[PDB]
Amino acid sequence: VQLYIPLEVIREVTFLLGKMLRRFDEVERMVGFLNEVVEKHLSLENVNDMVKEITDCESRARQLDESLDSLRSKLNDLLEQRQVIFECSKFIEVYMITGSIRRTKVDILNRILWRLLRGNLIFQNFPIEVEKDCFIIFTHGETLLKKVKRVIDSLNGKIVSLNTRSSELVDTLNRQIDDLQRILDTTEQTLHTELLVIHDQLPVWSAMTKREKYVYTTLNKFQQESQGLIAEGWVPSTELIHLQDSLKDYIETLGSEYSTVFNVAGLATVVTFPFMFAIMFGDMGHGFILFLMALFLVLNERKFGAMHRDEIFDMAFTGRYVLLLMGAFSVYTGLLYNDIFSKSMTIFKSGWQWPSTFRKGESIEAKKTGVYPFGLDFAWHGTDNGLLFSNSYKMKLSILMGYAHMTYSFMFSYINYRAKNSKVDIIGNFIPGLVFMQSIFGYLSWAIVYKWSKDWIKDDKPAPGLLNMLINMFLAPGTIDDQLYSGQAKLQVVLLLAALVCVPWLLLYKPLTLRRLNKFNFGDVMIHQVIHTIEFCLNCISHTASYLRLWALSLAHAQLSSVLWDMTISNAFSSKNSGSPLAVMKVVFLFAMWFVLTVCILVFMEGTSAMLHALRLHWVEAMSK
Amino acid sequence: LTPNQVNDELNKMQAFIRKEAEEKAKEIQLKADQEYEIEKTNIVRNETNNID
Amino acid sequence: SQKNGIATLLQAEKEAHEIVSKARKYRQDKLKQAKTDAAKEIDSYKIQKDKELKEF
C-alpha cells in the first residue's frame, strides 16, 4: 500500500502505525553514560522537557564523577607517598633516592640504572601494601644524579625527597589524607543521593529514546515530495480494512482537517501432533511420567509465568499444554498396547487360552477363545512370535493412520479452493489428486481392513499378500494369484486406469484452461504444473512409506523399554536370601539404575525424538497437501 | 468507516483546518496594524526634530 | 466518498497556506505605507511651522 501523511498529523500517524536523529543518538549516548555511572557507583513538548532533565542531570553527574575519580587519584598519590616513607624509615632503622614506581617497571629500572651506573648502586624494592612498588637506589657519587632522575621520571616513577624528617612530613601528609577522604565521603554521598532519583527513572528515559530514534529512523524511509510524506510498504491483506478503519477514525477524531490518502494448520495440530507422538511413544508408565511433569507445569503456570525463563525451559513452559496432551494420549495408547514400563496388563478376559497339560520346556501354541475387548491382547508378552504380530499390527496401523491424516489434510485444499471460488483449481488439482490418492493407497487401506474382516482359515482360502498385490496391480494387471475379493481382477484394472488417467489430467488441465481463458506466462504455469504433478505423484508414494516411522519409533521405544527392564530389574528378582540386607540393597540399587536410565533415555532423549518425528510428519506429510 | 462516518470525519477536520488558518492570518494582520503605527511614530519623530 | 474527501483536504491545506500568505503580503504593504504616510505627515507639520512664523 501507499500512504500520504500530511505534515500537520505526521507524528500522530507515525505513532499510530507503531502501535498497530543525531539528537537522539547523542541522548542515547547520554542515557548509556547514566547506565554506566549507576553500574559503576508522548507529545513533542513532553519529550522536549524530559530531554532537558536528561541533559541537565547528565552534566552534573559527569562533572561530579570527574571530580571524584580525579580526587581518588589524588588520594592514592598521597597513600603511595606515605608508604614510601614508612618503608624507607624502616630501611634506615634496620645520595639516596626514594620514590614510588609501578611494579612492572622495577626490573627494567634496575637494569637501566645498572647499565648507566656501571655497578655503583645498592638497589632495593619494597612492595607498597594498579599495584605499585618502592625503591631505594644509593647513587654512590655525583654527576649522574640528574640522570638517574631522567630514568625514573621517564617510565613514570615519582621520587619522594624528604630532606627534613621521616616524622614531620607524615603528620602534614596525614593532615591531608583524612582532609581529602572527607571530601570523598561528601561527594560520594552526593553521588549516591543523585543516583536514587535516576536508578528508578532510567527505564523511562531509555525507553523513550529507544522508540523515538526508531520513529525517526522510519521517518527517514519516507519520500518528502510535496510537503507531505509518502509511506510505501507492505501489509497483509487481512489487515487492509483494519488500516482503513483505524487510520480513518484517528485523523478525524483529532481535528486537523487535512485527510490522508491510502492507496493500494495449527488447529488440526492441537490433537494430531500429540497423537502422532503417542503412536511412537506408547507406554502407560513413561506416558504418566510425562503427563505428570506436564501437569506440574500446568498447575504452577502462575508462578512460572512471572519468571525469567532460559531457552530450554522457555521451550518446555511455552508448550506446557502440548506435553499435557502428549502424556494424556500416551496413557491411552499404552493402554491399547500392553506396555506399562514394558509389561502387560491383565485387565480384561483374554482371547487365547494355553493348554493345561504340557511338558516342561516345549513350544506350545494357544487356542483362540474370543477377541480381546479393548486394546492388544496380553497373551503376546513372553511370546516367540509375538513380535511378528506386533510388526504386522503396527505397520498396518501406521499405514492406516497416515492414510487418515493425509486424506483429512487433503480436504482442506478443497475448502481453500472453494473459499477462493476457483473451480479451475478444483478440477485441476483436487479431483485428479483425490482419485489418484484414493485409487491406490485408499485401496491399500481398504484392503488391510478387508483382510482383517475375513477369516481365511474357516473359509479354507489362502490369505493374500498385500505387498505383492500392489506390486502386481501395476506390473501384471488382471493376474491375481491369491484372490482377495470377488471381482478383484477387473476392478483393479479400473482403479489402475483411474490412477493413470490423472497423471496427464492433473498435468494438462490447468495450464491448457488458463491458456484458453486468454482467448500471463504459459511457461510459468506449464512448468509449475509439471513440477506440481511430479511432486504430488512422488509424495503420494513417498509419504505413506514415511508414516512407517510411527511403527519404527514405537518398536524402538518398546524394545528399549523391554531390554532395559531385562537388564536392570529382572536381575533384582530372586526368591533366595529373602529379607537379607544385600538382597534388598541389590533391589534398591537396580531400581535406581533403572529409573535414572528410563528418565534420561526413554523419556527425555527418546520422547524428544518422537516429538520431533511427529513434528516433521506435520511439517512435510500434512502441510504439503 | 462507511460513507456517512468518513464524511463526518471530513467535516470536523476542515473545520479545524480553516479555523486555524483564520487565526493565523488574523495575528499576522493584527501585527501589521501595530507595526504600521510604531514605525510611523518613529519616522515622524526624527523628522519633526530636524524641522523644529 | 473516500477519495473525493482526500481531494478536499489537500486543497484545504493549500488554502490554509494562501489565506496566511494573503495576510503576509498585507503586512509587508502596511510597512511601506508607514514610511509614505510619515512623509506626508512631515510636509503638513512644516506648513504648521510656517503658519506661526507668518503670524509672528
From Swiss-Prot, chain A:
A GO MF term: ATPase binding
Domain of life where this protein originates: Eukaryota
Keywords from the named record: Acetylation, Coiled coil, Endosome, Glycoprotein, Golgi apparatus, Hydrogen ion transport, Ion transport, Membrane, Phosphoprotein, Transmembrane, Transmembrane helix, Transport
Any GO BP annotation: Golgi lumen acidification
Region forming the signal peptide: none
Post-translational note: Glycosylated.
Membrane-topology descriptor: Multi-pass membrane protein
Presence of the UniProt keyword Isomerase in the record: no
Coiled coil: 44-85, 145-195
Annotated transmembrane regions: 265-281, 284-300, 315-344, 393-412, 431-451, 495-514, 534-558, 583-621
Gene Ontology CC: endosome membrane; fungal-type vacuole membrane; Golgi apparatus; Golgi membrane; late endosome; proton-transporting V-type ATPase complex; vacuolar proton-transporting V-type ATPase complex; vacuolar proton-transporting V-type ATPase, V0 domain
Plastid keyword on record: no
Cytoplasmic side: 301-314, 413-430
Main location per the UniProt record: membrane
Listed InterPro entries: V-ATPase_116kDa_su, V-type_ATPase_116kDa_su_euka
Subcellular localization, as worded in the UniProt entry: Endosome membrane; Golgi apparatus membrane
Membrane-side (Vacuolar) residue stretches: 282-283, 345-392, 452-494, 559-582
Family of the protein in this entry: Belongs to the V-ATPase 116 kDa subunit family.
Note: Present with 1084 molecules/cell in log phase SD medium.
Function description: Subunit of the V0 complex of vacuolar(H+)-ATPase (V-ATPase), a multisubunit enzyme composed of a peripheral complex (V1) that hydrolyzes ATP and a membrane integral complex (V0) that translocates protons. V-ATPase is responsible for acidifying and maintaining the pH of intracellular compartments. Is present only in Golgi- and endosome-residing V-ATPase complexes; enzymes containing this subunit have a 4-fold lower ratio of proton transport to ATP hydrolysis than complexes containing the vacuolar isoform and do not dissociate V1 and V0 in response to glucose depletion.
Assembly mode: V-ATPase is a heteromultimeric enzyme composed of a peripheral catalytic V1 complex (components A to H) attached to an integral membrane V0 proton pore complex (components: a, c, c', c'', d, e, f and VOA1).
Encoding gene per record: STV1
From Swiss-Prot, chain B:
Region (Interaction with VMA10): 12-31
Signal sequence range: none
Residue stretches in coiled coil: 8-38
Superkingdom to which the source organism belongs: Eukaryota
Subcellular location(s) per record: Vacuole membrane
Region (Interaction with VMA5), start-end ranges: 1-13
Miscellaneous note of the record: Present with 16134 molecules/cell in log phase SD medium.
Role played: Subunit of the V1 complex of vacuolar(H+)-ATPase (V-ATPase), a multisubunit enzyme composed of a peripheral complex (V1) that hydrolyzes ATP and a membrane integral complex (V0) that translocates protons. V-ATPase is responsible for acidifying and maintaining the pH of intracellular compartments.
Name of this chain's protein: V-type proton ATPase subunit E
Lineage: Eukaryota, Fungi, Dikarya, Ascomycota, Saccharomycotina
Full protein segment contained here: 8 to 59 of 233
UniProtKB/Swiss-Prot annotation, chain C:
Chief location of this protein within or outside the cell: membrane
N-acetylserine modification, residue list: 1
GO cellular component, one term: proton-transporting V-type ATPase complex
Keyword tags: Acetylation, Hydrogen ion transport, Ion transport, Membrane, Transport, Vacuole
A GO BP entry: proton transmembrane transport
Molecular function terms from GO: ATP hydrolysis activity; proton-transporting ATPase activity, rotational mechanism
Subcellular location: Vacuole membrane
TM annotation in the entry: none
Family statement drawn from the similarity comment of this UniProt entry: Belongs to the V-ATPase G subunit family.
Miscellaneous comment as given in the Swiss-Prot or TrEMBL entry: Present with 2280 molecules/cell in log phase SD medium.
Function per UniProt: Subunit of the V1 complex of vacuolar(H+)-ATPase (V-ATPase), a multisubunit enzyme composed of a peripheral complex (V1) that hydrolyzes ATP and a membrane integral complex (V0) that translocates protons. V-ATPase is responsible for acidifying and maintaining the pH of intracellular compartments.
Subunit structure: V-ATPase is a heteromultimeric enzyme composed of a peripheral catalytic V1 complex (components A to H) attached to an integral membrane V0 proton pore complex (components: a, c, c', c'', d, e, f and VOA1).
Protein name according to UniProt: V-type proton ATPase subunit G
Species: Saccharomyces cerevisiae (strain ATCC 204508 / S288c) (Baker's yeast)
Organism taxonomic ancestry: Eukaryota, Fungi, Dikarya, Ascomycota, Saccharomycotina
Gene that encodes the chain: VMA10
Full protein: residues contained: 2 to 57 of 114
